Each structure stands twice: as C-alpha cells, then as structure tokens.
Amino acid sequence: TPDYHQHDMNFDLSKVRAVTVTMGDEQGNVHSSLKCSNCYMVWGGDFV
Amino acid sequence: LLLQTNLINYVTSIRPNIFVGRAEGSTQYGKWYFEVMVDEVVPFLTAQATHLRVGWALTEGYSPYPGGGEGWGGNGVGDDLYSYGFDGLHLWTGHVARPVTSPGQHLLAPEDVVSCCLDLSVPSISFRINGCPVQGVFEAFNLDGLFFPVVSFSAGVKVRFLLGGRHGEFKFLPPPGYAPCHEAVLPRERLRLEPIKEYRREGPRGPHLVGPSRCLSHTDFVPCPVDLPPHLERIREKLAENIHELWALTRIEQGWTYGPVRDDNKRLHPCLVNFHSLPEPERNYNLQMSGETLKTLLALGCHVGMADEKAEDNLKKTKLPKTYMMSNGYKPAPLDLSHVRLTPAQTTLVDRLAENGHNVWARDRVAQGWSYSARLVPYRLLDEATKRSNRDSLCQAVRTLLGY
Amino acid sequence: LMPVSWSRMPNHFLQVERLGWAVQCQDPLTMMALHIPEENRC
Amino acid sequence: GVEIETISPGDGRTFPKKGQTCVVHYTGMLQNGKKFDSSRDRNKPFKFRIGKQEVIKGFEEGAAQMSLGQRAKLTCTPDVAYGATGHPGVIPPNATLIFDVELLNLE
C-alpha cells in the first residue's frame, strides 16, 4: 500500500509494520479484530 | 486522471522530554498514566475544523514536516503506522479512522479530560474519557524504540498539559499500578516542552537552521556489566587495609567511632575495626569485589605489572591528626599511594573500571526485581553526583599501582 | 526507492510554564495543495 | 435510509416544522473522501424552506431530525439522492453522499 516507506538493507518479514485493532461492547466481549499492515507479501524461501 | 487541488490548513505536534521503552535491563514498569485539560471553543475558525488529537508515537515518526503530507497536507498524529492517537470519536492508525462508543459520544470539547493508558506486557493502549472507559484497544505492536506523549492542534489552541507530581493535579485516580510519568526523566537536566524534528527556530538575529539531533535507543537504555602470578593474590589485605584506611577517614568527620549497635541515624558504625576483629562478611567485602576486579583487570586491557619493589615497605602512612584514635586502635592512616599521577589510559581505565562497578551493581539490583522497588540508571547515563564519588573511592584502590 | 527528495520551506510558520504548562497558539495559517490521485501524496 | 450520526451536541428541544425556514452551514462530501460542495468557502449560509421540495429528499429528512445548534453527519444512500443520471459534472452516477450539516439559527 502507498503508505510504506521502510528503506533498509536488513529487512526481514519480522520488520513489517502490522497493527491489530480490536473493538468490543461495554461488556468487554469483542466485536471485531482488524489488522492493518503496510505490506502484504510472502517469502520465496518458504517454498524452496 | 487529472490533478485536483484545494486549500489545506496547518498542524503541529508537541511532546515532552520523557522517554519510556521496554528492553532487557532497566525498563521501569511498563505502566504509565496522564491526563490533559482543553478549553478551546473554536470549531470552524478559518473554514475547516480544528484538528485536536492526543496519543502515543514511537521514536521514528518524522511526521511533522510542515507543509505537504500523504492524504491531505502535513497532518498530525494517527495518520501512519508510527503513531497511535484519539480524537474524541475515532481511532486513527494508517490514515484511516473508525468510530468509537462511549457515554456522551462527543469529540473533544472545552472543559474535558481524556486519560490514556500504557501496559507493555500485553502491550496494548487504551483510552478513557473524563470518567468512563473508551471501548477500544490497540494490540499487536512491534515495540522496538521508545514512545512520545504526542498532541495535535491546528491553531488558536491554549491546551494545558497534565503530568502529575511535579505540578499536574490528577483529577482522577489512576488504575492500580501506574507511574505518574514525572519520575521518568533524563537525570542530567530538567524537563520542558519542545517541538519534534524542528529544523527552524527563532533567535535574536532571527531564524536558526538546525540539523538532525541525537536520540537514545532500546540497546542504549540497558546496563551491561563487563564480562596466576603469586603477587597478584599475595597483596590482598595489603591493598584492602590500604583501602580500609579511608573507611574511617571521613567517618571521623562523621563521628562514627565504632558504634557497637550500628547507629544508622545517631552517628555510629559497627564495622570500624581491624579485619579479624571485623564481623564474618567483612573480609571478602573488601577483597572479593577487589580480587575479582584485579582478576577482571586483565580483561580491562591495562598495561600493569607488579615490579616496583622499592624497599617493599617505602609506602608510608599519613597519621597523627590529633587524637584520631578509637577503642580498636586503628587510627586510620592511608599509605603513600599519593604521589602516583597515573597514565592517560589510567584516567579512563579507572573510569572504565568505575563504569563496570556501577554496571555490575546495576545487574545485582536488577536481579532482585529491579531492587524490589521500595533509583540507579546505567553508567554514562546517570547523574553527575554519582559520577564523582565512584572515581575517588576506586582511585585509592587503583593508586596501589607502581607501589607493589 | 531513493531516500531523498527536495521539499520547499514555507515562508511563515505557526509562531508559538505556569499552572498546567499550557501551550500558546493564536493565529491561523493555511496553504494550497495538490492531490495527484494515482498514489496519493499531497 | 438516512443515517444521522451526531458530532456536537445541541439544544434538543427546538426542531424544524413545516413551512419554516432553516439556515444550514453544510459541507458535503462523497464516500471516497472527496469534497464536492461546501457552504463555508463562500461564507454564505444555505437557507431553505422545509416541505416545499427545494433540497433533495435526503437533505430535508436529514435536517428535520436535528435540533437547534446541533451538528451531525449524514450518509445519504444513492436511492434517495440522484439515483440514475445524477448531477452532471459534480457527482458521478450511483454515488453515496455524505453531509456534515449544522443548523445555525431559526429551528
């Protein structure tokens, strides 16, 4: 997505921004659990 | 297809000097709390609404950049993945907002209080309206640096910012276990409000262009303690007694002449006698931390070798300042380790050894649950007063160079 | 990706202790902007 | 369907009736976030008569549910405002309209 500006030479998939947003009721029981990430990729080393 | 255009107002962010983070070492508690006071009544001055937000941001923001931005203009907190904030009706992360629920359902208004939360084991951020919880929590972080209490404002704003024990009158009671955030300050200066990533500042001549500043990191805020010839183990007490001479020197000025009951407040001391006359944990008290220090001294990289042997007894003591004598008969008298002006490396080697001593004791304090609560920071980051005593105390032990 | 650009310096900024350590801000300020929609800077 | 979500509280007792003028200092937006109308760039508040079919259907069924001094946020569905052909040059066809209405005075 366009709001991604990580320019590093030591990048691994652990170095990916990911923020989990959860909301619930006043009872405390959750109501959704959204995860926004600035990057949606896989690792090619995870297949070969 | 085309290039649309419009008018955008301006916004700026302000943060305190405090710096909180979590890492292996001195990491405080991971439980912090503060409020804030707002009394602004200008919702539509100069067309667009007046942006007002508060929250957290990590120490890689670089957001301010007054002018252009990403969505529309150089916006404030919440429109990225490096800042988490709240406005009164929405949660902002990644420039996208979601509505929240609470009793009252109105955004920030004059005469109101908002309470933020911090808990770095779950790690998650919650918020609290003046007297009720806000139903929403951020989770799944990537905490690697530190955090800023950040505020956002467009213009025409006179917000008062609440801290705590210093002057912030906490209207409400923090939940069980939360530092008021005034304790966490750099122990080398006072606290103040400054704008983040400022590159122009006013002055008597006028504008001043300032480049990038410096900042700490997770690794920096972590103390780290450092990792046989017969004469090395032969001296022992000889250096210990020479160190033990000073143990009464200023404790004569204190007036603590061998207190038999350990008067901690009425000026007496129970370990002010000879080594054998001393209690059981008093010989390694001045030798174990010194023998290991000498054992570690090889790892210090110093160039030392016991080869003086000047009559093997020319190190004469200094004594006879009036009575100066106790029931024990010690009459403390430091030896002739006075005319030793050290070496350029020794000026730092003693400091380097002193840094190890502060770091080693820091690890010992950290082991017992960070001193088990109830005030010492990592070396080279600590205060100035602590940097004074530790030099002279270790110097006398180190002045034995070229004497034995 | 290249970690450099050339951004302009606005000619006027936002300008700006006691109980509460309040902030000071009176005057408003604004600017004109573009919204090239392909990738969305401004 | 008009979803009225409030933004700032109001009086809560004075509501518009038939045959009565209102002044509304609105600013309209689309679903994507692009503004297509504002009545504050002109510094001239919009005034309309309720019931005589001046405004669109979503605007008056939106302005009737509010109070004096209240500022709310509407989400007008495309069925009730410019369904098929739309308004040429401003609003694309089959687009959702969002209005941040604020009633200044006179119900």
Side-chain angles (χ1 to χ4, degrees), chain A residues 1-2 4-5 7 11 13-14 16-22 24 28 30-33 36-40 42-45 47, chain B residues 1-23 25-26 29-30 32-62 64-141 143-170 172 174-185 187 191-193 195-196 199-201 203-212 223 225-226 228-233 235-236 240-242 244-270 272-279 281-301 303-309 311-321 323-345 354 357 362 367 369 374 378 383-394 396-397 399-401 403-404, chain C residues 1-3 6 8-10 12-14 19-23 25 28-37 40-42, chain D residues 1-4 6-10 12-78 80-106:
Chain A
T1 177
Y4 158 73
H5 313 107
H7 170 243
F11 160 73
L13 279 176
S14 60
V16 172
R17 289 291 96 81
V19 178
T20 295
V21 180
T22 58
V30 307
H31 199 312
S32 79
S33 173
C36 297
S37 191
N38 51 353
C39 171
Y40 300 97
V42 306
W43 189 15
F47 307 126
Chain B
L1 261 173
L2 270 297
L3 280 69
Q4 293 82 17
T5 187
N6 201 357
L7 294 174
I8 301 299
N9 63 7
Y10 269 123
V11 298
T12 300
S13 281
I14 301 299
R15 82 291 182 276
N17 301 123
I18 63 170
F19 275 100
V20 65
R22 190 222 57 68
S26 175
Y29 293 100
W32 305 87
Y33 202 66
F34 65 106
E35 304 88 349
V36 64
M37 294 299 291
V38 295
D39 50 354
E40 311 325 326
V41 294
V42 286
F44 293 98
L45 188 153
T46 61
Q48 312 318 101
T50 306
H51 189 142
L52 271 183
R53 279 196 221 151
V54 286
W56 299 131
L58 61 83
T59 61
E60 275 87 12
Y62 277 167
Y65 278 157
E70 190 276 332
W72 290 78
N75 69 75
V77 65
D79 294 293
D80 62 347
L81 281 293
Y82 285 173
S83 80
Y84 311 128
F86 183 63
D87 60 2
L89 294 174
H90 285 82
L91 294 174
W92 300 82
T93 61
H95 193 73
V96 63
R98 285 83 151 198
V100 308
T101 177
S102 71
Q105 289 300 86
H106 66 275
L107 73 164
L108 288 147
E111 315 272 19
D112 283 275
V113 175
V114 76
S115 296
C116 170
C117 292
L118 195 142
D119 178 76
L120 293 175
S121 79
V122 186
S124 296
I125 318 167
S126 169
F127 295 103
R128 184 171 261 90
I129 202 60
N130 63 7
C132 317
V134 193
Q135 281 71 20
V137 187
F138 297 164
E139 293 179 353
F141 293 0
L143 72 164
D144 53 48
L146 283 72
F147 287 110
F148 293 103
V150 298
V151 69
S152 169
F153 64 103
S154 298
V157 163
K158 313 303 289 213
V159 172
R160 285 193 305 107
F161 182 76
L162 281 163
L163 281 193
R166 153 68 191 87
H167 203 79
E169 291 91 359
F170 273 23
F172 293 97
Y178 282 113
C181 312
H182 52 76
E183 181 65 26
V185 187
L191 73 165
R192 64 191 190 310
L193 296 172
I196 190 167
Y199 63 90
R200 296 180 67 250
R201 289 188 337 266
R205 304 311 91 91
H208 286 280
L209 292 86
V210 64
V226 299
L228 195 70
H231 43 91
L232 194 149
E233 79 203 349
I235 290 311
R236 290 279 284 174
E241 68 90 23
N242 214 342
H244 200 259
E245 299 302 300
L246 180 137
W247 202 276
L249 172 66
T250 176
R251 273 78 68 192
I252 298 305
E253 170 79 355
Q254 296 209 50
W256 286 26
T257 177
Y258 188 46
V261 293
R262 191 175 166 74
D263 291 331
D264 306 325
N265 279 333
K266 57 181 73 64
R267 325 290 308 282
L268 271 186
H269 202 286
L272 211 55
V273 297
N274 301 76
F275 289 99
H276 303 285
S277 306
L278 276 170
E282 277 284 332
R283 184 65 178 269
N284 57 2
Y285 181 57
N286 51 69
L287 277 180
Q288 184 176 357
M289 283 73 74
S290 89
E292 292 153 0
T293 292
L294 303 180
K295 191 265 159 184
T296 304
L297 188 152
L298 65 93
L300 265 71
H303 295 88
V304 193
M306 291 295 78
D308 168 271
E309 309 300 328
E312 205 261 331
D313 217 1
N314 201 3
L315 280 174
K316 189 49 62 195
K317 319 179 300 189
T318 300
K319 65 176 74 174
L320 213 68
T323 186
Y324 202 69
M325 48 204 177
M326 294 179 184
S327 44
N328 57 11
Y330 205 80
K331 196 173 171 66
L335 278 74
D336 199 74
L337 56 83
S338 43
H339 201 279
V340 191
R341 305 279 92 86
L342 59 83
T343 70
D383 303 68
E384 187 271 337
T386 312
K387 287 181 181 73
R388 301 282 82 86
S389 66
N390 72 327
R391 298 170 297 98
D392 307 294
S393 65
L394 182 163
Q396 311 311 102
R399 294 341 290 171
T400 189
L401 193 143
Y404 278 137
Chain C
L1 210 45
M2 283 73 74
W6 281 117
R8 274 181 31 110
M9 293 177 70
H12 298 282
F13 289 180
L14 277 296
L19 163 78
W21 292 352
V23 301
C25 192
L29 183 63
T30 193
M31 51 66 78
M32 181 145 198
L34 271 295
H35 187 193
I36 61 170
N40 199 327
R41 285 174 300 309
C42 182
Chain D
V2 186
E3 300 88 299
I4 200 180
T6 188
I7 301 182
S8 164
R13 311 161 295 103
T14 298
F15 310 88
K17 307 142 173 59
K18 38 200 264 293
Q20 189 169 200
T21 81
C22 320
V23 304
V24 153
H25 213 191
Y26 73 101
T27 171
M29 275 168 29
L30 282 172
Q31 195 145 52
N32 312 92
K34 304 144 182 310
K35 188 184 45 79
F36 76 105
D37 186 313
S38 159
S39 162
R40 313 176 119 139
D41 54 349
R42 312 191 264 283
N43 286 142
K44 175 107 178 62
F46 182 41
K47 41 182 60 188
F48 66 104
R49 303 260 240 24
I50 247 223
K52 311 171 76 75
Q53 290 180 149
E54 285 160 349
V55 294
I56 51 186
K57 273 184 60 178
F59 209 90
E60 52 187 11
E61 308 327 320
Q65 312 214 340
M66 355 186 6
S67 88
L68 199 158
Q70 204 200 355
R71 173 159 80 105
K73 171 146 162 308
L74 312 134
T75 296
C76 279
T77 191
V80 72
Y82 310 127
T85 187
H87 199 166
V90 193
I91 320 183
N94 284 146
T96 309
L97 277 87
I98 298 165
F99 289 107
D100 180 4
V101 286
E102 175 186 1
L103 264 147
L104 297 169
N105 62 51
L106 203 122

